[PDB]
Amino acid sequence: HHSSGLVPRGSHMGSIIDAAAAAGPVVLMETAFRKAVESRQIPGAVIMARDASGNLNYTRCFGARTVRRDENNQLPPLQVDTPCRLASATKLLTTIMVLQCMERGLVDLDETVDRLLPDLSAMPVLEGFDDAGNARLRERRGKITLRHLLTHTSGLSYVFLHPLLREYMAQGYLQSAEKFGIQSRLAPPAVNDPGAEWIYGTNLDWAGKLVERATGLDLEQYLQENICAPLGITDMTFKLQQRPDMLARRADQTHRNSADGRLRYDDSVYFRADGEECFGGQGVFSSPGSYMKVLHSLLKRDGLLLQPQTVDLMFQPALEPRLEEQMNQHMDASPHINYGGPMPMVLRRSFGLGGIIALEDLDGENWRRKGSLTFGGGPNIVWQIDPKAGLCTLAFFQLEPWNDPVCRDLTRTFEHAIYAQYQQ
Ligand SMILES: C[C@H]1C=C2C=C[C@H](C)[C@H](CC[C@@H](O)C[C@@H](O)CC(=O)O)[C@H]2[C@@H](O)C1
Numbered sequence: 001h002h003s004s005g006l007v008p009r010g011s012h013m014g015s016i017i018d019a020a021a022a023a024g025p026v027v028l029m030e031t032a033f034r035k036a037v038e039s040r041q042i043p044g045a046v047i048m049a050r051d052a053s054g055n056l057n058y059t060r061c062f063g064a065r066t067v068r069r070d071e072n073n074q075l076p077p078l079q080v081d082t083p084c085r086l087a088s089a090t091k092l093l094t095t096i097m098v099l100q101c102m103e104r105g106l107v108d109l110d111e112t113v114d115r116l117l118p119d120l121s122a123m124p125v126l127e128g129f130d131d132a133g134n135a136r137l138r139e140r141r142g143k144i145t146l147r148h149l150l151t152h153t154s155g156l157s158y159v160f161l162h163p164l165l166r167e168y169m170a171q172g173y174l175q176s177a178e179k180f181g182i183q184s185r186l187a188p189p190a191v192n193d194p195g196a197e198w199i200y201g202t203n204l205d206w207a208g209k210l211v212e213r214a215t216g217l218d219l220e221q222y223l224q225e226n227i228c229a230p231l232g233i234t235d236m237t238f239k240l241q242q243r244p245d246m247l248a249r250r251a252d253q254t255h256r257n258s259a260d261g262r263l264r265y266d267d268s269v270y271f272r273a274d275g276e277e278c279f280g281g282q283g284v285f286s287s288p289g290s291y292m293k294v295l296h297s298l299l300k301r302d303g304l305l306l307q308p309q310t311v312d313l314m315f316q317p318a319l320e321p322r323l324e325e326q327m328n329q330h331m332d333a334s335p336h337i338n339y340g341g342p343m344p345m346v347l348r349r350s351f352g353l354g355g356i357i358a359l360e361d362l363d364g365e366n367w368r369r370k371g372s373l374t375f376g377g378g379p380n381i382v383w384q385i386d387p388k389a390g391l392c393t394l395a396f397f398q399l400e401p402w403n404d405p406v407c408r409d410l411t412r413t414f415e416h417a418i419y420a421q422y423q424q
């Protein structure tokens with residue numbers, strides 16, 4: 001029997017295997033991440049989950065912030081406080097900033113953008129090309145409103161995404177609309193009328209300009225005063241190159257080679273230059289920890305960023321049946337883009353203010369629920385907030401291209417495991 005003075009413990013294989021309970025979902029999931037790093041499938045990742053109550057506050061960091069060895073021949077770790085490129089995960093921040101302007105009476109969401117963005121209002125709609133091949137433009141039908149910008153229903157697209165605009169760049173209309181290797185998000189014309197269709201575009205870059213003009217502050221200052229300060233965030237910024245402390249610790253971008261699935265250093269323009277202008281659709285750097293602070297505040301409805309009622313509005317389906325149907329047809333037919341990331345590839349969705357809303361449970365009682373809000377950023381960053389489950393989660397990588405199968409699979413296992421053990 002037991003040993004005098006010593007805590008009773010396992011003393012043979014049977015009793016040690018019974019004293020240590022079988023591996024739960026979360027433990028098994030963490031093994032997958034470690035194996036992915038060990039086998040060089042990913043450089044690293046940070047995964048974070050929080051509930052409203054505080055009972056759940058889970059942060060795990062795996063692997064490295066880069067594939068470039070440091071001065072000591074080591075690969076430095078990806079940490080919860082590592083400065084990372086958020087890319088389109090910036091869009092949530094900019095959305096919150098617009099809603100703050102609305103709360104303070106500076107703007108109305110259904111107001112036309114003419115007053116603050118007359119430069120946008122004056123922009124034409126691109127409608128194919130001539131029989132010869134000249135650029136064919138026309139005047140916009142109807143007015144763009146702030147709500148159209150927040151829901152990507154303005155008619156604006158992205159140059160890399162839409163065929164007409166890809167041809168626009170190829171024909172040379174946007175050659176001088178770049179700075180330090182970063183293309184302007186304000187130069188290109190619209191590809192449809194507001195209200196006509198859901199189209200992913202430069203809407204939040206325009207929405208950012210609107211904030212700057214409505215407040216008389218640049219977006220960086222507005223961000224610091226209105227998002228960072230209230231949450232005690234000191235490392236979230238549009239202006240990475242002016243923060244030598246963050247520069248010393250920042251992640252490098254990694255790219256997966258199309259040919260052999262191998263990881264390589266990606267010398268990304270975004271890590272060497274900020275751009276003079278703060279682009280609200282993409283330009284923020286922060287750590288995973290700081291981003292979670294934002295998500296968690298929204299989940300708590302604590303009133304630090306927005307009134308609880310304004311946060312509730314973000315989660316309400318914003319599209320009328322016609323656009324809702326068109327958005328789902330577009331997304332279901334575009335698994336090569338996959339805006340929804342880890343979500344099932346066919347799902348009934350809508351768009352709120354700040355992201356995609358699930359209009360059905362993803363897998364009954366096992367995963368994200370109806371009413372959950374989600375979006376992401378290019379380097380395989382995925383965030384979601386699920387008020388019914390009482391959870392919000394964040395899967396943070398610094399790996400392009402977007403929609404990497406290894407990252408998506410890992411992100412799914414992460415979420416499934418967290419929901420299995422901690423959803424309520
Ligand atoms: C066909 C459309 C789908 C796309 C899917 C993912 C990316 C965003 C594409 C363009 C971005 C570009 O930087 C990535 C390309 O190098 C992809 C490739 O051709 O290997 C985009 C474009 O190819 C247009």
Ligand SMILES: C[C@H]1C=C2C=C[C@H](C)[C@H](CC[C@@H](O)C[C@@H](O)CC(=O)O)[C@H]2[C@@H](O)C1
Pocket residue numbers: 088160161200337338339340375376377378379400401402
């Ligand atoms: C929610 C996600 C939706 C997207 C839709 C189309 C693209 C695949 C986006 C990522 C593009 C990004 O990886 C590459 C761009 O930085 C290239 C460029 O800016 O020209 C993606 C990201 O914006 C996040």
